[PDB]
mmCIF file of C-alpha atoms (C1' of nucleotides) in Angstrom:
data_model
loop_
_atom_site.group_PDB
_atom_site.id
_atom_site.type_symbol
_atom_site.label_atom_id
_atom_site.label_comp_id
_atom_site.label_asym_id
_atom_site.label_seq_id
_atom_site.Cartn_x
_atom_site.Cartn_y
_atom_site.Cartn_z
ATOM 1 C CA UNK A 965 127.730 102.462 88.516
ATOM 2 C CA UNK A 966 128.023 104.745 91.612
ATOM 3 C CA UNK A 967 125.504 107.117 89.998
ATOM 4 C CA UNK A 968 123.041 104.369 89.085
ATOM 5 C CA UNK A 969 119.400 104.919 89.977
ATOM 6 C CA UNK A 970 118.001 101.839 91.766
ATOM 7 C CA UNK A 971 114.733 101.071 93.436
ATOM 8 C CA UNK A 972 115.782 102.754 96.624
ATOM 9 C CA UNK A 973 116.647 106.017 94.858
ATOM 10 C CA UNK A 974 113.406 105.841 92.854
ATOM 11 C CA UNK A 975 111.263 105.234 95.907
ATOM 12 C CA UNK A 976 113.043 107.991 97.932
ATOM 13 C CA UNK A 977 112.598 110.392 95.055
ATOM 14 C CA UNK A 978 108.898 109.500 94.595
ATOM 15 C CA UNK A 979 108.123 110.080 98.269
ATOM 16 C CA UNK A 980 110.122 113.345 98.243
ATOM 17 C CA UNK A 981 108.043 114.632 95.258
ATOM 18 C CA UNK A 982 104.849 113.855 97.166
ATOM 19 C CA UNK A 983 106.153 115.942 100.047
ATOM 20 C CA UNK A 984 107.820 118.841 98.245
ATOM 21 C CA UNK A 985 106.552 118.790 94.613
ATOM 22 C CA UNK A 986 109.139 120.048 92.062
ATOM 23 C CA UNK A 987 112.143 119.517 94.194
ATOM 24 C CA UNK A 988 114.897 119.909 91.513
ATOM 25 C CA UNK A 989 116.087 123.198 93.121
ATOM 26 C CA UNK A 990 116.411 121.575 96.626
ATOM 27 C CA UNK A 991 118.243 118.360 95.696
ATOM 28 C CA UNK A 992 121.324 119.632 97.529
ATOM 29 C CA UNK A 993 119.294 119.978 100.779
ATOM 30 C CA UNK A 994 117.580 116.648 100.340
ATOM 31 C CA UNK A 995 120.806 114.689 99.869
ATOM 32 C CA UNK A 996 122.526 116.506 102.721
ATOM 33 C CA UNK A 997 119.793 115.652 105.211
ATOM 34 C CA UNK A 998 119.506 111.962 104.199
ATOM 35 C CA UNK A 999 116.135 112.131 102.395
ATOM 36 C CA UNK A 1000 117.817 111.084 99.149
ATOM 37 C CA UNK A 1001 120.731 108.754 98.817
ATOM 38 C CA UNK A 1002 123.888 110.389 97.333
ATOM 39 C CA UNK A 1003 123.688 110.684 93.550
ATOM 40 C CA UNK A 1004 124.512 113.634 91.253
ATOM 41 C CA UNK A 1005 122.051 116.495 90.983
ATOM 42 C CA UNK A 1006 121.919 115.991 87.172
ATOM 43 C CA UNK A 1007 120.967 112.330 87.629
ATOM 44 C CA UNK A 1008 118.231 113.086 90.169
ATOM 45 C CA UNK A 1009 116.978 115.902 87.899
ATOM 46 C CA UNK A 1010 116.835 113.574 84.840
ATOM 47 C CA UNK A 1011 115.035 110.932 86.936
ATOM 48 C CA UNK A 1012 112.540 113.593 88.157
ATOM 49 C CA UNK A 1013 111.755 114.590 84.572
ATOM 50 C CA UNK A 1014 111.405 110.933 83.443
ATOM 51 C CA UNK A 1015 109.120 110.094 86.417
ATOM 52 C CA UNK A 1016 106.900 113.075 85.663
ATOM 53 C CA UNK A 1017 106.676 112.295 81.945
ATOM 54 C CA UNK A 1018 105.787 108.704 82.835
ATOM 55 C CA UNK A 1019 103.045 110.030 85.154
ATOM 56 C CA UNK A 1020 101.694 112.226 82.333
ATOM 57 C CA UNK A 1021 101.718 109.314 79.895
ATOM 58 C CA UNK A 1022 100.007 107.049 82.464
ATOM 59 C CA UNK A 1023 97.214 109.595 83.056
ATOM 60 C CA UNK A 1024 96.700 110.282 79.302
ATOM 61 C CA UNK A 1025 96.410 106.509 78.611
ATOM 62 C CA UNK A 1026 93.909 106.040 81.384
ATOM 63 C CA UNK A 1027 91.831 109.060 80.153
ATOM 64 C CA UNK A 1028 91.715 107.515 76.688
ATOM 65 C CA UNK A 1029 90.799 104.062 77.938
ATOM 66 C CA UNK A 1030 88.092 105.382 80.227
ATOM 67 C CA UNK A 1031 86.656 107.462 77.441
ATOM 68 C CA UNK A 1032 86.341 104.533 75.031
ATOM 69 C CA UNK A 1033 84.888 102.282 77.762
ATOM 70 C CA UNK A 1034 82.260 104.988 78.591
ATOM 71 C CA UNK A 1035 81.303 105.664 74.980
ATOM 72 C CA UNK A 1036 80.618 101.937 74.531
ATOM 73 C CA UNK A 1037 78.653 101.777 77.832
ATOM 74 C CA UNK A 1038 76.547 104.815 76.825
ATOM 75 C CA UNK A 1039 75.343 103.033 73.635
ATOM 76 C CA UNK A 1040 74.138 99.950 75.566
ATOM 77 C CA UNK A 1041 72.552 102.121 78.178
ATOM 78 C CA UNK A 1042 70.748 104.079 75.339
ATOM 79 C CA UNK A 1043 69.700 100.794 73.662
ATOM 80 C CA UNK A 1044 68.454 99.414 76.999
ATOM 81 C CA UNK A 1045 66.393 102.628 77.697
ATOM 82 C CA UNK A 1046 64.433 102.384 74.398
ATOM 83 C CA UNK A 1047 63.437 98.764 75.147
ATOM 84 C CA UNK A 1048 62.315 99.690 78.676
ATOM 85 C CA UNK A 1049 60.340 102.510 77.060
ATOM 86 C CA UNK A 1050 58.988 100.444 74.136
ATOM 87 C CA UNK A 1051 58.016 97.801 76.740
ATOM 88 C CA UNK A 1052 60.299 95.063 75.329
ATOM 89 C CA UNK A 1053 62.081 94.815 78.673
ATOM 90 C CA UNK A 1054 60.094 94.949 81.948
ATOM 91 C CA UNK A 1055 60.972 97.858 84.144
ATOM 92 C CA UNK A 1056 59.211 96.191 87.130
ATOM 93 C CA UNK A 1057 61.954 93.678 88.107
ATOM 94 C CA UNK A 1058 65.325 94.268 86.335
ATOM 95 C CA UNK A 1059 68.576 92.372 87.238
ATOM 96 C CA UNK A 1060 70.969 94.164 89.612
ATOM 97 C CA UNK A 1061 73.536 93.918 86.826
ATOM 98 C CA UNK A 1062 72.278 95.649 83.685
ATOM 99 C CA UNK A 1063 73.438 98.286 81.118
ATOM 100 C CA UNK A 1064 72.303 101.250 83.252
ATOM 101 C CA UNK A 1065 74.101 99.907 86.365
ATOM 102 C CA UNK A 1066 77.305 99.127 84.370
ATOM 103 C CA UNK A 1067 77.281 102.727 83.087
ATOM 104 C CA UNK A 1068 76.636 104.231 86.536
ATOM 105 C CA UNK A 1069 79.301 102.289 88.378
ATOM 106 C CA UNK A 1070 81.886 103.037 85.669
ATOM 107 C CA UNK A 1071 81.029 106.773 85.822
ATOM 108 C CA UNK A 1072 81.426 106.995 89.590
ATOM 109 C CA UNK A 1073 84.436 104.629 89.680
ATOM 110 C CA UNK A 1074 87.423 106.242 91.390
ATOM 111 C CA UNK A 1075 90.448 104.006 91.216
ATOM 112 C CA UNK A 1076 94.110 104.830 91.595
ATOM 113 C CA UNK A 1077 95.923 105.578 88.285
ATOM 114 C CA UNK A 1078 99.129 103.614 88.863
ATOM 115 C CA UNK A 1079 102.371 102.838 86.975
ATOM 116 C CA UNK A 1080 105.623 100.953 87.551
ATOM 117 C CA UNK A 1081 108.862 102.829 87.240
ATOM 118 C CA UNK A 1082 112.347 101.358 87.249
ATOM 119 C CA UNK A 1083 111.179 98.256 89.059
ATOM 120 C CA UNK A 1084 109.288 100.179 91.745
ATOM 121 C CA UNK A 1085 105.596 99.390 91.411
ATOM 122 C CA UNK A 1086 102.311 101.223 92.151
ATOM 123 C CA UNK A 1087 103.468 104.857 91.731
ATOM 124 C CA UNK A 1088 100.338 107.098 91.654
ATOM 125 C CA UNK A 1089 100.416 109.202 88.528
ATOM 126 C CA UNK A 1090 97.555 111.539 89.537
ATOM 127 C CA UNK A 1091 99.084 112.140 92.967
ATOM 128 C CA UNK A 1092 102.411 113.083 91.510
ATOM 129 C CA UNK A 1093 100.887 115.450 88.962
ATOM 130 C CA UNK A 1094 98.496 117.167 91.283
ATOM 131 C CA UNK A 1095 100.944 117.500 94.204
ATOM 132 C CA UNK A 1096 103.526 119.245 91.960
ATOM 133 C CA UNK A 1097 100.852 121.634 90.592
ATOM 134 C CA UNK A 1098 99.257 122.145 94.032
ATOM 135 C CA UNK A 1099 102.546 122.928 95.832
ATOM 136 C CA UNK A 1100 103.697 125.166 93.015
ATOM 137 C CA UNK A 1101 100.418 127.043 93.251
ATOM 138 C CA UNK A 1102 100.695 127.364 97.076
ATOM 139 C CA UNK A 1103 104.305 128.472 96.999
ATOM 140 C CA UNK A 1104 103.421 131.081 94.492
ATOM 141 C CA UNK A 1105 100.474 132.360 96.472
ATOM 142 C CA UNK A 1106 102.572 132.816 99.618
ATOM 143 C CA UNK A 1107 105.689 134.152 97.856
ATOM 144 C CA UNK A 1108 103.670 136.586 95.750
ATOM 145 C CA UNK A 1109 101.751 138.280 98.575
ATOM 146 C CA UNK A 1110 103.291 137.177 101.961
ATOM 147 C CA UNK A 1111 106.919 136.544 101.134
ATOM 148 C CA UNK A 1112 108.272 138.466 104.098
ATOM 149 C CA UNK A 1113 105.843 136.914 106.574
ATOM 150 C CA UNK A 1114 104.074 133.725 105.554
ATOM 151 C CA UNK A 1115 102.084 133.640 108.871
ATOM 152 C CA UNK A 1116 100.105 136.580 107.465
ATOM 153 C CA UNK A 1117 98.764 134.388 104.647
ATOM 154 C CA UNK A 1118 95.026 134.750 104.325
ATOM 155 C CA UNK A 1119 92.359 132.946 102.303
ATOM 156 C CA UNK A 1120 90.618 136.351 102.031
ATOM 157 C CA UNK A 1121 86.957 136.164 101.145
ATOM 158 C CA UNK A 1122 87.241 132.696 99.627
ATOM 159 C CA UNK A 1123 84.972 130.574 101.891
ATOM 160 C CA UNK A 1124 85.805 126.892 101.889
ATOM 161 C CA UNK A 1125 83.247 124.194 102.850
ATOM 162 C CA UNK A 1126 83.309 123.506 106.575
ATOM 163 C CA UNK A 1127 84.829 120.262 107.853
ATOM 164 C CA UNK A 1128 82.183 117.771 109.047
ATOM 165 C CA UNK A 1129 82.324 116.357 112.580
ATOM 166 C CA UNK A 1130 85.946 117.066 113.369
ATOM 167 C CA UNK A 1131 86.893 116.466 116.973
ATOM 168 C CA UNK A 1132 88.581 119.880 117.164
ATOM 169 C CA UNK A 1133 87.068 123.325 116.525
ATOM 170 C CA UNK A 1134 88.303 123.838 112.952
ATOM 171 C CA UNK A 1135 87.607 127.107 111.053
ATOM 172 C CA UNK A 1136 88.960 129.060 108.086
ATOM 173 C CA UNK A 1137 91.865 130.154 110.325
ATOM 174 C CA UNK A 1138 93.046 126.582 110.843
ATOM 175 C CA UNK A 1139 92.769 126.020 107.078
ATOM 176 C CA UNK A 1140 95.147 128.975 106.619
ATOM 177 C CA UNK A 1141 97.586 127.688 109.239
ATOM 178 C CA UNK A 1142 97.522 124.143 107.786
ATOM 179 C CA UNK A 1143 98.487 125.588 104.374
ATOM 180 C CA UNK A 1144 101.251 127.711 105.834
ATOM 181 C CA UNK A 1145 102.404 124.506 107.597
ATOM 182 C CA UNK A 1146 102.503 122.664 104.244
ATOM 183 C CA UNK A 1147 104.472 125.555 102.607
ATOM 184 C CA UNK A 1148 106.948 125.547 105.495
ATOM 185 C CA UNK A 1149 107.479 121.821 106.131
ATOM 186 C CA UNK A 1150 105.947 119.920 103.141
ATOM 187 C CA UNK A 1151 102.881 117.930 102.453
ATOM 188 C CA UNK A 1152 102.574 115.010 104.920
ATOM 189 C CA UNK A 1153 104.719 116.694 107.565
ATOM 190 C CA UNK A 1154 101.852 116.728 110.016
ATOM 191 C CA UNK A 1155 103.930 116.230 113.198
ATOM 192 C CA UNK A 1156 106.060 119.329 112.398
ATOM 193 C CA UNK A 1157 102.931 121.335 111.463
ATOM 194 C CA UNK A 1158 101.157 120.213 114.660
ATOM 195 C CA UNK A 1159 104.166 121.106 116.807
ATOM 196 C CA UNK A 1160 104.847 124.615 115.428
ATOM 197 C CA UNK A 1161 103.665 127.033 118.088
ATOM 198 C CA UNK A 1162 103.283 129.857 115.563
ATOM 199 C CA UNK A 1163 100.627 127.862 113.760
ATOM 200 C CA UNK A 1164 98.244 127.466 116.778
ATOM 201 C CA UNK A 1165 96.948 124.085 115.749
ATOM 202 C CA UNK A 1166 98.846 121.839 118.235
ATOM 203 C CA UNK A 1167 95.671 120.918 120.134
ATOM 204 C CA UNK A 1168 93.567 120.560 116.947
ATOM 205 C CA UNK A 1169 95.303 117.674 115.224
ATOM 206 C CA UNK A 1170 95.205 114.056 116.373
ATOM 207 C CA UNK A 1171 98.041 111.791 115.163
ATOM 208 C CA UNK A 1172 89.487 107.637 116.705
ATOM 209 C CA UNK A 1173 89.855 111.461 116.888
ATOM 210 C CA UNK A 1174 89.631 113.599 113.705
ATOM 211 C CA UNK A 1175 91.675 114.986 112.026
ATOM 212 C CA UNK A 1176 94.466 112.510 111.722
ATOM 213 C CA UNK A 1177 97.053 112.311 108.983
ATOM 214 C CA UNK A 1178 94.654 111.127 106.242
ATOM 215 C CA UNK A 1179 92.049 113.825 106.958
ATOM 216 C CA UNK A 1180 94.637 116.562 106.857
ATOM 217 C CA UNK A 1181 95.954 115.304 103.461
ATOM 218 C CA UNK A 1182 92.401 115.334 102.016
ATOM 219 C CA UNK A 1183 91.740 118.759 103.412
ATOM 220 C CA UNK A 1184 94.901 120.207 101.894
ATOM 221 C CA UNK A 1185 94.024 118.683 98.435
ATOM 222 C CA UNK A 1186 90.578 120.189 98.695
ATOM 223 C CA UNK A 1187 91.752 123.607 99.777
ATOM 224 C CA UNK A 1188 94.351 123.980 96.987
ATOM 225 C CA UNK A 1189 91.901 122.659 94.339
ATOM 226 C CA UNK A 1190 89.325 125.056 95.769
ATOM 227 C CA UNK A 1191 91.727 128.066 95.578
ATOM 228 C CA UNK A 1192 92.879 127.045 92.054
ATOM 229 C CA UNK A 1193 89.269 126.833 90.903
ATOM 230 C "C1'" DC B 1062 105.224 98.364 116.486
ATOM 231 C "C1'" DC B 1063 105.161 102.701 113.248
ATOM 232 C "C1'" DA B 1064 103.689 104.923 108.773
ATOM 233 C "C1'" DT B 1065 100.877 105.805 104.188
ATOM 234 C "C1'" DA B 1066 97.781 104.112 100.494
ATOM 235 C "C1'" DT B 1067 93.821 101.783 98.268
ATOM 236 C "C1'" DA B 1068 89.301 99.125 97.294
ATOM 237 C "C1'" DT B 1069 85.089 99.143 98.984
ATOM 238 C "C1'" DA B 1070 80.478 100.405 100.958
ATOM 239 C "C1'" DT B 1071 78.001 104.050 102.687
ATOM 240 C "C1'" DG B 1072 76.505 108.656 103.501
ATOM 241 C "C1'" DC B 1073 76.461 113.369 102.317
ATOM 242 C "C1'" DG C 969 81.175 114.840 92.968
ATOM 243 C "C1'" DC C 970 83.921 114.129 97.933
ATOM 244 C "C1'" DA C 971 84.564 112.187 102.873
ATOM 245 C "C1'" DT C 972 84.812 108.612 105.746
ATOM 246 C "C1'" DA C 973 85.704 104.002 108.364
ATOM 247 C "C1'" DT C 974 87.010 99.483 107.551
ATOM 248 C "C1'" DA C 975 90.001 95.900 106.104
ATOM 249 C "C1'" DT C 976 93.976 95.206 103.990
ATOM 250 C "C1'" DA C 977 98.619 95.679 101.772
ATOM 251 C "C1'" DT C 978 103.231 97.193 101.974
ATOM 252 C "C1'" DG C 979 107.556 100.007 103.342
ATOM 253 C "C1'" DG C 980 110.070 101.235 107.523
#
DNA sequence: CCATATATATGC
DNA sequence: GCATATATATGG
């Protein structure tokens, strides 16, 4: 009853995981500041575990489905190639929609891997899983080597790809500061990151101009994937 | 209004 | 493969 997990708790929890990753140890803070409605720590912890196992299941299903679809598409593609080569089918004016184009589009397809959870729809299973792993990795990087002063965090000799056509002058140093920002305030907390005078990126973030919120999110994902290898 | 997220077409 | 702008959807 009073400890029941409804849609509002599910959606608040989901959004909090996307900001903080594995937040089981900070439930007390998150309830106290209004991020999560009041429920027991145990219930929120159970719900976290359930939501992450459902994400894992959703991703594993999609991997399996995609694999089988591709295997079948490969065979038709292979059968279509031998006819083109044996001359049975004319290479000189093929339909837009053919076995090779079906295979190619499926291969390059990038679509959200989504599931419904306790009556809340369209939770992104990949986003959940990668954000938890990414934020764990980032926290460990900073707490292993820069625990006493996170502002000293360095990418070292790792050289990330440069941003393309950003409206601000954005270098490796800003990448470092963005990541320290994420460690301090959470993923998606771009206003707080922008406004922190210690981070020196107040004039470099644009919340037309690039980067906005979406570009910053993509850049953090890239950087943490890049560091993790 | 604000926000984030996604399918899509396009370029890199 | 990813990055982006656009149009569009949906929660706040």
